[PDB]
Amino acid sequence: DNLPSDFDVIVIGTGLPESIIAAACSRSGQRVLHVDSRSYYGGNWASFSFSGLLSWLKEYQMWQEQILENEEAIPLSSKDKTIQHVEVFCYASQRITYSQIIKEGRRFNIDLVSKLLYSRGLLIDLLIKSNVSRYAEFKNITRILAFREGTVEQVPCSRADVFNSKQLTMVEKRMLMKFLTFCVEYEEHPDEYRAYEGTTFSEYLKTQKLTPNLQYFVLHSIAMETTSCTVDGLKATKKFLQCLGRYGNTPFLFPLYGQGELPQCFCRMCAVFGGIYCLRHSVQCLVVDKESRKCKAVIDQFGQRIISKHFIIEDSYLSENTCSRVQYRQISRAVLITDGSVLRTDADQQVSILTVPAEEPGSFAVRVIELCSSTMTCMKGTYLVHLTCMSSKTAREDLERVVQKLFTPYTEIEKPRLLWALYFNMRDSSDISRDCYNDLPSNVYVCSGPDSGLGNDNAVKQAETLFQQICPNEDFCPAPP
């Protein structure tokens, strides 16, 4: 087969936002070409088998002739620089040994992105409406966890939980119900919080009918850095409460095989409606009409000039020159292979989220998501643990302390054993305005990579905003006929 010379939309990168927009454009009738320079889908949203991940690690450890005089070229990146400070530690022998992890390497699906799916939210709504939901399966998150004086414990997550709690006094239960009842319908009691709109949520809670113990739970386990405004906290608290019980006792779900499956789900929709897919296919440069200033085509790695009306490019593919003024943020990540849960119980197949507030000001709160083998992301006998936080320093510097208090790296003596650990910082290019990039043609749209939030509102919103610009007056991802 041979690649067509013209398309309506060319999308470079198969991360989550790019794939949702590709699927949206193809569904609406646009002829889409979707490429990725990698030999697998997802960009920084991908998951890996264990050997796949070892392969991924390594990395971070002329067309001029075809340009006519009335055109100019904008070269694209030739090397990905979104990943920094990779540090891998193997504590297992080189019951479970390193050799056993390798043997069962194909049982692992290790995400570069640690996120959960809110039972009610933009992505789950989109998955259901578009019918992309048929391409995946999910597991309920069963436990919300927190630290109670150096000890990890499960926090109440339902009416029944508050009733059976022996850790809250009768007055506290009354205070809590009263307060969460209000949070649910908060926007209906304006003056109730009006005076505290310009103050932090943490400060607000201090002026409410709640003990400090209760305030802590609300702030760290429900609303979930520390300077967020009162209204931001109320919206968060309400969202959490509203999600309760839609699919399970908590507000979250997690996709079977990992988050890495989602981008592929949207790419399939794109493919189903005629989108054309080329992995292992990079683009060398954009061809811009020197006069109109609009991008006319791309020249790929094989020197083929391909025409399009719209060009969607994920940030990591733009050159350092195009991005010379951009100020990125960073995300600290850690991936752990462990041999026991952070909270041991009879029932082992628990999927949990533990929040770890910053010990001292200056650093950010840490999220810890524990995946059991039934999530199909790790081998039987292990758990896959993901830690995440907005970065302060290197990922190991921001995260090793938390790892140190939850696990032991030894075989000989409570703490589950840490078998394998990976630390890395990932570029956060979310919320960056077009104007930050240099000389972008108006028909070149930029997608960001993963953001640091728990859910996927950022990816869904940017995709819908782009879709509106490219396919005005069209429905966004309607179910197939």
Partner: protein, 182 residues
């Protein structure tokens, strides 16, 4: 409701999509293929067969890993009038093993379909294909015609049966409950 996941692999143009459509809808066209389901009978047992199409992602060999997961049977197709498509059969089989990573690889159910026999200029001999399928753990071989509806229903009878045997063995080892569907 026992559900069987079947995927159809092979080079672009051999008739993978037409074979799926012929089986399920008993129709053949001269634009939105995804996956179809059909309630089939496998040795007196009613089962749901779910057949997944490549959605054209194979054109430039860009089928990702999620497409292969949970597959109970892998159908390999080639055009009897196109020796080139028959020669890639080994590559697609190897790719299925790498991508799906099933338990007991060597005994995974593959079924080979020599399609377009309705054409008067075949170039791959029946004996030559049967031999190849034999060199791969005695893989069942069928010659089909999506167009003239020949041997399609018959070929899917063993696909269904072999997929049922595989999924049954998979469920026998499954300790986890059913995952959530939105």
């Amino acid at each position: 409701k026992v559900l069987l996941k079947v995927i159809i692999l092979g080079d672009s143009g051999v008739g993978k999509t037409s074979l799926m459509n012929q089986y399920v809808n008993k129709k053949f066209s001269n634009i939105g293929a995804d996956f179809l389901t059909k309630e089939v009978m496998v040795d007196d047992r009613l089962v749901t067969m779910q057949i997944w199409d490549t959605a054209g992602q194979e054109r430039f060999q860009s089928l990702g890993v999620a497409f292969y997961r949970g597959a109970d049977c892998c159908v390999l197709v080639f055009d009897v009038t196109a020796p080139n498509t028959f020669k890639t059969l080994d590559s697609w089989r190897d790719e299925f093993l790498i991508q799906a990573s099933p338990r007991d690889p060597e005994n995974f159910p593959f079924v080979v379909l020599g399609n377009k026999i309705d054409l008067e200029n075949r170039q791959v001999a029946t004996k030559r294909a049967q031999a190849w399928c034999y060199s791969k753990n005695n893989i069942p071989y069928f010659e089909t015609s999506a167009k003239e509806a020949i041997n399609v229903e018959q070929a899917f009878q063993t696909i269904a049966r072999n997929a049922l045997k595989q999924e049954t063995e998979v469920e026998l080892y499954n300790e986890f409950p059913e995952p959530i569907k939105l």
